[PDB]
C-alpha cells in the first residue's frame, strides 16, 4: 500500500526472531530507506529503529513535553503516557495519530503529529503538533482511542478508532487536513453487543477487493492474566457491514480468532498488518510470560487462503 511503504522486501523470507529491545504495548511499523521504525505506547511516545527488522534498539520519543491542548480534553490526566500510534505516509508527509487518555474513562482525544521524515539526522525532522482529530467526552457513547488510517482503493483516507462503548468507529477523513471534516458522520462498525463491550484497537487493510477489519476481543494490562484475542471480519464496502467466516456480523460479536495466544505468548493483541510484494506480517505485543508478563512486541508473516482469509503459519 502507498500509505505503508516497505519496497521490495520479503517478509515470508526474513527470519523474525527478534532481539534487543523488545517491551512494547500497541506498536506499529515504517520503514523509510534502510530504516525500520516502531512507535508504540509510552511517555510522549515511544521510538525503536531498526537496520533490519529483526534487532532493535530504544531510541528517543516524539513529545519531550506534552502538548498543553490535551487539558482541553483530559484535565484528569496526569502522567505522560500516550497510547497506540498509527503511522502513515502520504504526500512526502508522516501523519502519527495518537491517544490521550486516562484508563477506563472515555473522556479521550486523538492527537495528530506529523514529520516530513522519521529521521532525526535529516535537517528537517521534526514532529510538529497539529493538534486533535476527534475526541469523546463521559457524554458520548463510544471512546476516542485507538486510530488507524486506511486509504480506500478510490484514495479516499478514513479513520477507524475505538475502545468499549458501543465499540469501533469509522469515519472519512479529508485529504488536505488529514481530518474529519466538521459534519463528517461517525459510523459504528463493530462491537460485541455484550456489555462490557470488550472490543477495540482496530486496524482495516484491503486486498483483492475486500476490507478486513482486524480487532482485538477481550482483555488487555492484566500480565499473563489478560485474555486479548485477535479477530477479523471483512466487507466489500470500506463501510461495512464486515462479516465472519460464519457469516456473522461483526456488529453482533462476529469475528473469526486469528490468534488467541498460549502459555508462553498470552494475550496477542493490538494488531497491525503490513504488505510487501506478496508478503505480509502481522505486528502485534503479547505478554511475556515468560518475564513478568510484560508487553512485548510480535511480528510474523501473515498469510491468506484461497478463500482471501488471512493466518498465521506454524
Ligand atoms: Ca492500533
Known amino acids: 500500500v502507498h500509505f505503508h511503504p516497505f519496497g521490495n522486501v520479503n517478509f515470508y523470507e526474513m527470519d523474525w526472531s527478534l532481539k534487543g529491545d523488545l517491551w512494547a504495548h500497541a506498536p506499529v511499523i515504517a520503514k523509510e530507506g534502510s530504516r525500520w521504525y516502531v512507535f508504540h505506547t509510552g511517555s510522549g ?33 496526569d502522567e505522560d503516557h500516550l497510547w497506540a500510534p498509527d503511522i502513515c505516509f502520504y504526500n512526502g508527509i508522516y501523519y502519527l495519530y495518537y491517544s490521550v487518555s486516562t484508563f477506563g474513562k472515555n473522556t479521550s482525544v486523538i492527537g495528530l503529529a506529523t514529520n516530513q521524515t522519521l529521521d532525526p539526522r535529516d535537517p528537517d525532522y521534526e514532529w510538529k503538533d497539529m493538534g ?50 466538521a459534519q463528517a458522520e461517525l459510523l459504528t462498525i463493530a462491537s460485541r453487543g455484550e456489555e462490557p463491550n470488550a472490543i477495540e484497537a482496530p486496524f482495516i487493510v484491503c486486498r483483492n477487493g475486500y476490507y478486513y477489519l482486524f480487532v482485538s476481543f477481550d482483555f488487555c494490562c492484566r500480565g499473563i492474566e489478560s485474555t486479548y484475542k485477535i479477530a477479523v471480519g471483512r466487507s ?18 462476529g469475528g473469526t480468532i486469528l490468534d488467541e495466544g ?25 505478554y511475556d510470560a515468560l518475564k ?23
Open 132 to 181: 486533535p482529530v476527534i475526541h469523546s467526552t463521559a457524554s458520548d457513547n463510544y471512546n476516542a482511542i485507538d486510530p488507524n488510517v486506511v486509504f480506500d482503493q478510490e484514495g479516499q483516507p478514513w479513520l477507524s478508532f475505538g475502545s468499549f462503548w458501543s465499540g469501533i468507529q469509522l469515519i472519512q477523513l479529508d485529504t488536505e487536513t488529514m481530518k474529519p471534516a
Open 45 to 77: 511516545i515511544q521510538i525503536k529503529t531498526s537496520e533490519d527488522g529483526v534487532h532493535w534498539e530504544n531510541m528517543g520519543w516524539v513529545f519531550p513535553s506534552l502538548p498543553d491542548w490535551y487539558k482541553q480534553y483530559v484535565p484528569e490526566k
Open 292 to 314: 513478568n508478563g510484560e508487553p512485548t512486541l510480535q511480528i510474523r508473516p501473515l498469510y491468506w487462503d484461497d478463500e482471501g482469509w488471512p493466518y498465521l503459519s506454524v
Open 236 to 253: 466489500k464496502d470500506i463501510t461495512g457491514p464486515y462479516v465472519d467466516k460464519n457469516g456473522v456480523s461483526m456488529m453482533q460479536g
Open 262 to 286: 498460549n502459555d508462553r505468548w498470552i494475550g496477542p493483541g493490538h494488531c497491525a498488518v503490513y504488505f510487501s510484494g506478496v508478503s505480509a506480517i502481522l505486528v502485534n505485543h503479547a
